Design a binder for this molecule. Structure first.
Ligand SMILES: *C(=O)CCCCCCCCCCCCC
Ligand SMILES: *C(=O)CCCCCCCCCCCCC
Lengths: 160, 160
């Protein structure tokens, strides 16, 4: 059954806090969050494929639509918009007006290099690798850093 | 907006995995999970009170009903049953047939002392402390350990 995001967001917060304690270095935390996200994505994809009707596909644009309109809604309760497609159609952006994971959070002094929700990039990359799609996911905008929106840039590297 | 539990459960899994790496001792992990839960509960209560109609109360039985029928549903998508009330009415149990947090999980060799979802005990204790209620929350049954259900025993210690 569906649930609100508050407990999830606070739990993610505990994770970030623990990593900051474990490494005392924002860059290390960013790296670990992405790694964990990757491992999560490799597992999460099995659940998604079982609960969706995409079957076996490899189309990048279809993948963008499914990620934004189905996966994000299913696992985070939000529907980001798909924007800025590259001429080649191998790059696009996910625009989030609101990011549940940053609720109740206030990025402190000197923590500017920290990419708080970096876990999501790993999830996207790990999940897509399992469907034979090598991609690059990265944050280019973050409301926690004063930006108007949160933006995840997606780039298709090659088929695996 | 509401969301499924899979990403939350896998994220919690990453947290437990990290703690196991950080301490290499199940008892330490249990302790840290509970501590984190406590900190989460102290914050989560503010969100709950703002989104509920309980106002300022201190009744233990009412609290049990609200926890099981409102809070668990709101934050975890499940409604545990309330059972085994003590004669004094200062103790009760939360019975969970299904615990989202243990999905996709298989408690390994020698990890028997680990209380995988211990975070929840801390959440309950921390949240209740903020409403002037000192309590003890502990797992007495766990489906991960072969039990028929997951059981969280709640005991009212005193008003703060
Ligand atoms: C076929 O060409 C489309 C296949 C799309 C598969 C998308 C899998 C995404 C699941 C994980 C994303 C989680 C985002 C929060
Ligand atoms: C008045 O006597 C009842 C007040 C009950 C407050 C309950 C607060 C519970 C919120 C945190 C529990 C989270 C469980 C997943």
């Amino acid at each position: 059954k569906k649930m609100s995001s508050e407990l999830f967001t606070l739990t993610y917060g505990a994770l970030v806090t623990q990593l900051c304690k474990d490494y005392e270095n924002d860059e290390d935390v960013n790296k670990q969050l992405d790694r964990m996200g990757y491992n999560i994505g490799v597992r999460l994809i099995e659940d998604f494929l079982a609960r969706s009707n995409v079957g076996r596909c490899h189309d990048f644009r279809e993948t963008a639509d499914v990620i934004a309109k189905v996966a994000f809604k299913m696992y985070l309760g939000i529907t980001p918009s798909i924007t800025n497609w590259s001429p080649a159609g191998d790059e696009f952006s996910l625009i989030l007006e609101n990011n549940p994971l940053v609720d109740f959070v206030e990025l402190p002094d000197n923590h500017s290099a920290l990419i708080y929700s970096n876990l999501l990039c790993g999830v996207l990359r790990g999940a897509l690798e399992m469907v034979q799609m090598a991609v690059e996911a990265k944050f280019v905008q973050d409301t926690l850093k004063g930006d108007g929106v949160t933006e995840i840039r997606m780039r298709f590297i090659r088929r695996i």
